[PDB]
């Protein structure tokens, strides 16, 4: 179009390299150009890291991906343009913007290896930018593209025992099934092929984030920030697209059996592993986000996690409540989660029937209610102005919306007791509502 000529002129002005640009311009003069003769000069221009040349080359590649179309090579070279923290800020920003333009467009929808590599690259710049603004914009682009992948999957759907035993219950086999680069599309079984491609893209993104989370102070360090962003992206995927996970229509072809299976069962092992080896940590933020994920699991996927919810509650969370030396921040966070649970009557009666009614399964509902009661008795504060401040410190029923956070770079006991008591009152209200 209009921009390709200008970009080629700029790269020729910056100049071995130039002859490609003049050859491409001559080719356009006979108009519409050959994809290779325009791709090669930009690739050679971005092969070197300079101020004006690399940026315009990357921008031209990204904008040209938006039309016609090679795609694998363009994505690979755009990712390769980022050497690391040595690369200056503007080059990283241009790389991020070009990746966003390449992944996102009305037409040309890359599937398989290219999209996953682009997402991984954007995450890499987010992790190793060594610059606040570039990190922030990289995280924004990463979460936006991660959300829009599952948005595409949602549109396609719309138009359609102990803790150590959870390490090896890999129900779904995914031996090198992903990373199919050649798949790309624009704008009976014919539709199902594209649907399966989109499902595979979503599954590969989720698997990449699970592998990021399973890894393993310094909350601004690299591994901790990686774990935080992985967990937050997983939570965002569960929250903003819960209808994708819970929809039985959404299915994925198996690898070693080539049999369609429910998406939730395909990622059941990954999510369970992401909670088991990562929840109940000694750092507050990780435990908080893990509790968010577990609560989403408990409120929306009881049927597909009947045993795993039991294991989580018994070994991770209720054990945390029972511990006398357990941190109070984690206790208060999970008590807030319990209060969020108490408002749901179905999530209480199904929790009673599937767990307490069964003899072998350990008592769940009774013990969580007793744990709430134990918190609802002891009281440290005596000064009523603390009670007045807490009452003033009020902003309700748990309702869901878009969730996103940003890691760019009064007494706890009393509020915990009040939350426990309010959760018990909510439990009684929910029970009398379920009785009618």
């Amino acid at each position: 179009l209009k921009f390709v000529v200008s970009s080629l002129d700029i790269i020729a002005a910056q100049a071995q390299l130039a002859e490609l640009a003049e050859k491409a311009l001559a080719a356009i003069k006979e108009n519409l150009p050959d994809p290779e003769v325009v791709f090669a000069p930009l690739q050679l221009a971005t092969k070197s890291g300079t101020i004006p040349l690399t940026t315009t080359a990357l921008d031209c590649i990204g904008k040209l991906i938006s039309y016609s179309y090679l795609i694998e090579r363009a994505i690979d070279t755009i990712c390769d343009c980022f050497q690391g923290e040595t690369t200056l800020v503007e080059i990283q920003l241009q790389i991020v913007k070009s990746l966003l333009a390449a992944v996102l467009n009305d037409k040309i929808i890359v599937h398989g290896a290219g999209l996953l590599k682009a997402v991984r690259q954007v995450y890499n710049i987010f992790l190793l930018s060594r610059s606040t603004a570039n990190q922030q914009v990289a995280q924004g682009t990463l979460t936006q593209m991660v959300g829009t992948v599952f948005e595409r999957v949602k549109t396609r759907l719309h138009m359609k025992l102990t803790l150590k035993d959870l390490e090896h219950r890999k129900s779904f086999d995914d031996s090198h099934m992903g990373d199919g680069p050649t798949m790309v599309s624009q704008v009976p079984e014919s539709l199902d092929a594209e649907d399966e491609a989109y499902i595979r893209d979503a599954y590969l993104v989720f698997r990449s984030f699970c592998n990021l989370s399973t890894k393993i102070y310094d909350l601004r360090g690299q591994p901790m920030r990686s774990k935080l962003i992985s967990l937050h992206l997983i939570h965002t995927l569960l929250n903003n697209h819960i209808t994708v996970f819970t929809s039985p229509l959404c299915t994925i072809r198996n690898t070693k059996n080539n049999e369609p299976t429910n998406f939730l069962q395909a990622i059941k092992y990954y999510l369970c592993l992401s909670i088991t080896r990562n929840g109940a940590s000694s750092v507050d933020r990780v435990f908080d986000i893990c509790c968010e994920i577990f609560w989403l699991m408990l409120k929306y996927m009881r049927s597909s996690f009947k045993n795993e919810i039991e294991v989580f509650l018994n070994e991770i969370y209720l054990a945390l409540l029972a511990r006398r030396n357990a941190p109070l921040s984690q206790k208060l966070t999970f008590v807030g989660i319990l209060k969020r649970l108490c408002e749901d009557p179905r999530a209480l009666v199904e929790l009673y029937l599937n767990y307490d009614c069964n003899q072998n399964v350990d008592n769940i509902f009774q013990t969580i209610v007793e744990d709430l009661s134990r918190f609802a008795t002891a009281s440290v504060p005596i000064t009523p102005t603390q009670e007045q401040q807490y009452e003033e410190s009020r902003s309700t029923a748990g309702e869901w919306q878009i969730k996103s956070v940003l890691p760019p770079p009064l007494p706890k006991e009393y509020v915990m007791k009040r939350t426990a008591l309010d959760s018990l009152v909510e439990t009684l209200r929910s029970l009398v509502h379920w009785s009618q």
Binding site: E387, L424, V425, L428, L431, W434, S435, Q436
Partner: protein, 104 residues
Amino acid sequence: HVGPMFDATWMSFFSTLSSLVQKTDVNKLCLEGMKLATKIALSTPREAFISMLKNTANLNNPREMQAKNVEALKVLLDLAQTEGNYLKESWKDVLLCISQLDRL
């Protein structure tokens, strides 16, 4: 369907912590929790909660009431109004409260 949970965890459990009304707000929703005594909507939970509500109403000892006692009496009267068919033998405590209230 709450029947198993009616008798599983109420009689000697919920009254225990709801007897925090002896220490002071929180009293309002504690009384509201006592109001949610489901009388199989078998008699031990109803008897315990109604006895506790009558005791915290403290009608038989006037000139010692506060807003807490008035709220408890209001809750007990409302529970009598909205659940008449189910108090069964527990009506005696409600009528005792009414009679003592008549003495002002």
